[PDB]
């Protein structure tokens, strides 16, 4: 998996590759790694896929209740504290590793979080098996005060680095753009640089190719 986060002058951008792997096998070639905690708070996950998805949902649910209760827009720091405290309580055994990004009434935020419950903050971050390739790009091309279009390009280049160089990563780029003062902009398959070429033939069998012992109608 390759996920990154990139802050820009007026918001934050999050991005991920789209390959999920059962061992050295690809189960899903067009998976969705960009999850919504709340309308303007989004997160990308690596590590144990079930933990990443479950913990996303748990906090999202609670953030929603919190928001309804307090009559306030959910804050990224709230997702942060709730997640890290939950992950810490479980002493690493929930193998979630997340980059969480967002905008809220206090501004725009970017955090990473690891299974044991530790968190970092910065202007650009990466996680997952392809994070070294992505971080090499970020370390080469980041600059302060990116425009939206520049942070999209940079984050998208970083995911690409993992797609091309990390066997753990592949297929497409997904981005979400969270700008201050606007609706979060989720771009599913922003890039699709890995379409299968046309096969050499169709493998449709002539009807009756397959031997049947018995047949019957099932009633729903």
């Amino acid at each position: 998996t390759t996920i990154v986060g990139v802050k820009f002058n007026n918001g934050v951008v999050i991005a991920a590759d789209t390959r999920s792997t059962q061992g050295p096998i690809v189960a899903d070639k067009n998976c969705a790694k960009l999850h919504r905690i709340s309308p303007k708070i989004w997160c990308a996950g690596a590590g144990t896929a079930a933990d990443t998805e479950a913990v996303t949902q748990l906090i999202g649910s609670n953030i929603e209740l919190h928001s309804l209760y307090t009559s306030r827009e959910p804050r990224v720091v709230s997702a942060l504290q709730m997640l890290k405290q939950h992950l810490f309580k479980y002493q690493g055994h929930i193998g979630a590793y997340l980059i969480v990004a967002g905008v809220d009434p206090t501004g725009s935020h970017l955090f990473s979080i690891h299974a044991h419950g530790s968190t970092d903050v910065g202007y650009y971050l990466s996680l997952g098996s392809g994070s070294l390739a992505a971080m090499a790009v970020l370390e080469s091309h980041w600059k302060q005060d990116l425009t939206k279009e520049e942070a999209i390009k940079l984050a998208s280049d970083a995911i690409q680095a993992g797609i091309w160089n990390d066997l753990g990563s592949g297929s497409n780029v997904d981005v979400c753009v969270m700008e201050i003062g606007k609706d979060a902009e989720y771009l599913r398959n922003y890039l699709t640089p890995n379409v299968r070429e046309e096969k050499q033939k169709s493998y449709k069998f002539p009807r009756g190719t397959t031997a049947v012992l018995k047949e019957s109608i099932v009633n729903i």
Binding site: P39, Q57, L58, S61, L65, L68, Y69, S71, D183, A184
Partner: protein, 246 residues
């Protein structure tokens, strides 16, 4: 106090539930009207001081994106039910199915909560009746009343609280099964105008609708399959607008 405080009397009636209803009957009028393309729920905002800011309180509450509620009776009982109702929608439904509960089942959970207060040791029943307006994909629009007993009934239209007898009557005359949301809103206003003693504007009236999905209230774009919320509360401005050209 590990015993029921609601018990049967020789006439078979349960006093604490009856007295709970009395509290409800004493509350500010609120009402609901079901249209063909929506539902409306409404109430008056009696401010118990002019120095109070009534906007900081909300008698009409969003429960899910497609379900809202209003009440007559004891406000704090209501506030607390609202908190419980939002949570049970996540804990017994959304976290299992990844979907918000349909209206009738969420009504059913709140009913359970209220029934329990009429049987468990050491507690009085809730002193509110709720009207609950919702939409769901397989039942469409609905409207329910829940009582302190935990009983609930589906309505085409009804009123509760102080001026409910006249309001139910007014609603009987004006209601037909072809109202569009806008008719139902209009009728709700005319109805609330009888009950309202004192000021009557967008600032003493609370009003919400369950209607069409609002993609503009979603907060994000990109998932086209993602439905906007059907619940919307009307602004002060929007309510006054209708009031002038009443």
């Amino acid at each position: 106090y590990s015993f029921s405080l609601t018990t049967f009397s020789p006439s078979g009636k349960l006093g604490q539930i009856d007295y709970a209803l009395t509290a409800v009957k004493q509350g500010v009028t609120s009402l609901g009207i079901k249209a063909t393309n929506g539902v409306v729920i409404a109430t008056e905002k009696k401010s118990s001081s002019p120095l109070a800011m009534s906007e900081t309180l909300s008698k009409v509450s969003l429960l899910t994106p497609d379900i809202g509620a209003v009440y007559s009776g004891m406000g704090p009982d209501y506030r607390v039910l609202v908190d419980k109702s939002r949570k049970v929608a996540h804990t017994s439904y959304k976290r299992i199915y990844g979907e918000y509960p349909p209206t009738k089942l969420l009504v059913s959970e709140v009913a359970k909560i209220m029934q329990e207060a009429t049987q468990s040791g050491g507690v009085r029943p809730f002193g509110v009746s709720l009207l609950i307006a919702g939409h769901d994909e397989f039942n469409g629009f609905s409207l329910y009343q829940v009582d302190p007993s935990g009983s609930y009934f589906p309505w085409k239209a009804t009123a509760i609280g102080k001026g409910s007898v006249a309001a139910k009557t007014f609603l009987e005359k004006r209601w037909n099964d072809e109202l569009e949301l806008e008719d139902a809103i209009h009728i709700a206003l005319l109805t609330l105008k009888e009950s309202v003693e004192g000021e009557f504007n967008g600032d003493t009236i609370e009003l919400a609708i369950i209607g069409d999905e609002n993609p503009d209230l979603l907060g994000y774009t990109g998932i086209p399959t993602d439905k906007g919320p059907r619940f919307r509360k009307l602004t002060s401005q929007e309510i006054n607008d209708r009031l002038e050209a009443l």
